[PDB]
Amino acid sequence: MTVVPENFVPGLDGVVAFTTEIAEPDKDGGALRYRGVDIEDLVSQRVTFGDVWALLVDGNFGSGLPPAEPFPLPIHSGDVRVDVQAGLAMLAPIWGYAPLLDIDDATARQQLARASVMALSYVAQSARGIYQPAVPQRIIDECSTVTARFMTRWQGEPDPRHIEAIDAYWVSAAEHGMNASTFTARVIASTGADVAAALSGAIGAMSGPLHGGAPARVLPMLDEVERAGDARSVVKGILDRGEKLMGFGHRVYRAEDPRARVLRAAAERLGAPRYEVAVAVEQAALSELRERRPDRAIETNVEFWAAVVLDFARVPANMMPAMFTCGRTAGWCAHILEQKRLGKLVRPSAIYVGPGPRSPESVDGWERVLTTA
Amino acid sequence: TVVPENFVPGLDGVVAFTTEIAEPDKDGGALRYRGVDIEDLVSQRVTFGDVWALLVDGNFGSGLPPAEPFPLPIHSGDVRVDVQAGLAMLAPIWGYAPLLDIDDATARQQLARASVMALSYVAQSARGIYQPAVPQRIIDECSTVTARFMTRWQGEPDPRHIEAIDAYWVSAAEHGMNASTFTARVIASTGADVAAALSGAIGAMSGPLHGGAPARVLPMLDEVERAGDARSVVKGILDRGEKLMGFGHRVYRAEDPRARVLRAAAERLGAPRYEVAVAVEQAALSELRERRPDRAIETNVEFWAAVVLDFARVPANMMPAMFTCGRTAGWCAHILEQKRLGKLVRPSAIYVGPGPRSPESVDGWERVL
Numbered sequence: 001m002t003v004v005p006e007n008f009v010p011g012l013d014g015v016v017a018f019t020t021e022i023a024e025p026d027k028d029g030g031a032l033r034y035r036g037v038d039i040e041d042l043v044s045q046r047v048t049f050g051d052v053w054a055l056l057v058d059g060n061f062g063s064g065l066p067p068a069e070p071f072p073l074p075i076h077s078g079d080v081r082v083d084v085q086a087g088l089a090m091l092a093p094i095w096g097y098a099p100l101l102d103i104d105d106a107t108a109r110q111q112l113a114r115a116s117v118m119a120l121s122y123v124a125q126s127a128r129g130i131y132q133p134a135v136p137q138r139i140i141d142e143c144s145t146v147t148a149r150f151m152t153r154w155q156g157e158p159d160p161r162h163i164e165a166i167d168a169y170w171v172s173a174a175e176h177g178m179n180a181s182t183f184t185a186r187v188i189a190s191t192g193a194d195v196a197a198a199l200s201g202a203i204g205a206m207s208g209p210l211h212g213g214a215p216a217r218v219l220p221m222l223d224e225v226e227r228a229g230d231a232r233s234v235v236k237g238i239l240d241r242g243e244k245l246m247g248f249g250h251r252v253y254r255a256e257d258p259r260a261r262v263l264r265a266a267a268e269r270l271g272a273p274r275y276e277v278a279v280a281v282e283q284a285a286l287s288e289l290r291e292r293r294p295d296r297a298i299e300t301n302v303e304f305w306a307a308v309v310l311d312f313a314r315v316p317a318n319m320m321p322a323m324f325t326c327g328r329t330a331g332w333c334a335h336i337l338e339q340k341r342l343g344k345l346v347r348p349s350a351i352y353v354g355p356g357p358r359s360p361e362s363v364d365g366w367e368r369v370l371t372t373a
Numbered sequence: 374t375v376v377p378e379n380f381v382p383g384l385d386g387v388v389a390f391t392t393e394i395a396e397p398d399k400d401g402g403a404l405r406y407r408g409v410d411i412e413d414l415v416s417q418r419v420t421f422g423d424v425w426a427l428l429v430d431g432n433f434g435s436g437l438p439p440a441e442p443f444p445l446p447i448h449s450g451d452v453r454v455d456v457q458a459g460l461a462m463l464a465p466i467w468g469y470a471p472l473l474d475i476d477d478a479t480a481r482q483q484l485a486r487a488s489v490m491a492l493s494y495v496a497q498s499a500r501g502i503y504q505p506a507v508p509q510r511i512i513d514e515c516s517t518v519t520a521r522f523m524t525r526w527q528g529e530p531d532p533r534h535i536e537a538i539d540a541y542w543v544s545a546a547e548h549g550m551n552a553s554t555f556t557a558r559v560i561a562s563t564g565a566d567v568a569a570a571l572s573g574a575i576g577a578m579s580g581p582l583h584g585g586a587p588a589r590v591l592p593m594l595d596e597v598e599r600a601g602d603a604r605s606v607v608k609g610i611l612d613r614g615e616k617l618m619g620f621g622h623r624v625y626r627a628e629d630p631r632a633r634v635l636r637a638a639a640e641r642l643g644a645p646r647y648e649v650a651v652a653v654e655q656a657a658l659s660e661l662r663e664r665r666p667d668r669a670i671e672t673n674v675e676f677w678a679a680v681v682l683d684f685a686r687v688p689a690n691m692m693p694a695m696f697t698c699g700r701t702a703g704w705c706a707h708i709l710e711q712k713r714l715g716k717l718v719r720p721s722a723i724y725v726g727p728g729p730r731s732p733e734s735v736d737g738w739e740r741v742l
């Protein structure tokens with residue numbers, strides 16, 4: 001008889017696959033820490049994304065992310081995710097990226113940083129589009145931070161406070177543990193392949209709708225409440241139609257997500273025009289959902305305030321998933337470097353529950369098969 | 374106080390899925406596709422397209438369709454990079470929706486369209502940009518996708534070479550759960566489009582640690598052609614410290630069924646390197662077992678994969694792409710199985726890093742704006 005482990009969980013839910021020193025998503029304590037440093041501390045003191053990238057990868061504020069070299073994007077497919085996923089994979093031949101097996105830690109760290117900032121450059125060019133002239137390097141070179149250079153390359157003359165919005169969002173979305181995309185990067189890195197191939201694979205896993213973390217569409221709901229005037233009526237109407245309230249649902253932490261609280265505070269101080277309506281919608285959505293089902297513990301998803309912050313920086317909705325990918329490159333690179341030092345291939349097992357030995361003549365459609373008989 | 378739950382890193386020996394696709398019966402020394410032995414499939418010369426349908430669908434009847442005309446848009450100098458990048462760009466132009474928004478029939482059709490697209494991309498990339506493309510009219514004269522692949526790449530393929538590739542691809546179609554197959558399932562579990570899953574799996578196959586890629590034995594095989602004594606040459610390689618390529622421990626009970634199948638194909642098709650290769654196999658096996666009478670030493674399947682692939686005029690740099698082409702059958706079958714399972718793959722990790730500390734206490738804080 002074919003048996004299965006007693007604590008068999010399809011999808012490896014709750015199974016410990018690694019021990020990491022990178023970050024601690026303290027869901028019981030309601031805090032998020034990068035190498036022991038709270039994200040609230042990082043975002044309150046206005047630490048740029050390039051420095052947080054160094055902190056996660058290196059464990060200290062050693063060497064920040066360098067600027068991207070001039071490299072026009074070679075892929076124009078109409079999908080920003082596809083453009084950067086394919087673009088990164090082709091960096092290995094032209095830049096001579098060796099397999100992770102054949103390089104030391106210092107080479108891998110430089111390669112990770114070089115490609116990480118190239119992914120940001122590729123997204124900015126793809127977002128700008130092919131029907132618009134490229135921004136000259138001189139305007140980009142006037143900027144001081146990586147985040148500022150990204151917006152300048154994409155928008156030309158971005159609002160300085162919109163740059164501050166992206167830094168708050170990118171830091172808050174830099175790393176959140178062993179998600180599907182981070183797991184994908186570590187598995188590819190565990191084969192010894194080049195860092196470009198590992199980053200490209202993780203981009204593909206992030207594209208999936210079920211991955212979680214991409215900003216949900218809440219602008220149609222926010223626009224309606226601004227027009228109607230009563231938030232409680234709008235949320236009740238959406239629920240009464242059999243639809244789901246976007247941006248709200250089951251709790252992830254024990255309470256309010258620390259990333260969600262950080263993003264809401266950023267929208268207030270930076271002067272988000274939608275902040276007043278968004279707060280009113282949040283309290284109405286919580287009150288309606290916490291009363292209709294008083295048993296569930298329901299909090300606000302971080303994707304609700306991520307959309308508000310990204311919309312404030314004038315990011316189109318179809319571009320929002322790409323903004324999430326750009327920030328997550330810090331967490332991806334940190335886990336890739338840690339996996340290289342770990343030095344063990346990741347290969348789980350599978351239990352066969354299929355048919356037993358059967359002759360080919362016993363398979364449906366065998367007569368159609370052409371053979372030497 | 375921070376303690377792990379009696380684990381080892383890398384998920385070794387941990388069951389992640391149950392599968393109906395294939396059973397690598399290592400303790401019985403047999404490999405079966407949906408219960409069908411690969412030895413039976415090869416002995417009756419079942420083509421790769423039919424085996425692709427058997428793995429994905431569980432039955433024959435609708436094999437791999439011919440590839441549509443599409444000149445390869447990526448020329449990076451690496452065949453793996455070309456196909457991996459090219460497959461990812463199929464989604465926007467072909468309207469590939471995420472796996473969450475399509476039914477099984479749509480997913481199966483999209484997998485077949487991309488799977489045969491990957492073979493065409495590899496053939497075009499191998500042929501290079503310094504040569505004109507083979508016209509579609511000549512390709513249509515062929516009857517199988519394996520013959521279409523050789524025609525698109527070489528132009529005037531030897532019929533024996535086509536049979537050699539067909540035998541190798543069947544044995545390399547699927548070998549259970551591995552890093553590349555695991556990667557394809559993980560990406561599919563997010564609901565992403567099948568093109569993204571295949572592109573990610575190709576990157577996983579690129580890694581040297583994956584295993585199964587054709588062994589580097591040509592310099593050694595060329596050597597025994599000179600000396601003429603297999604026994605003398607192998608002993609020298611061990612004596613000066615190097616490792617005999619293509620030989621190692623046991624994988625199955627005694628013999629890998631794919632290795633026996635591939636070797637039988639070499640003699641059936643009159644491979645010139647066959648006589649030398651068998652002599653090296655016996656010389657390497659006898660000396661390795663004699664030096665270490667405890668460890669079970671058996672011929673790696675990748676040793677005979679190099680012999681068969683080289684016979685078909687496949688260069689050494691192309692051999693990893695050849696392995697990628699054959700494995701597309703297994704990846705497509707597992708992606709469809711993952712689609713029906715509908716459970717996201719999301720493991721957990723334990724934090725063993727530094728405790729809560731202020732940013733000022735971290736080294737290098739003074740160099741931060």
Ligand SMILES: *[Se]c1ccccc1C(=O)Nc1ccccc1
Nearest residue numbers: 142143144145148152160163164
């Ligand atoms: Se971009 C740019 C262009 C000219 C002068 C200064 C800048 C700049 O760095 N702006 C900025 C960076 C970071 C945060 C807010 C604003």
Ligand SMILES: *[Se]c1ccccc1C(=O)Nc1ccccc1
Nearest residue numbers: 514515516517520524532535536
């Ligand atoms: Se390809 C080709 C071109 C012209 C005529 C016949 C073929 C052909 O089918 N060759 C072949 C296919 C499969 C196995 C052996 C040979």
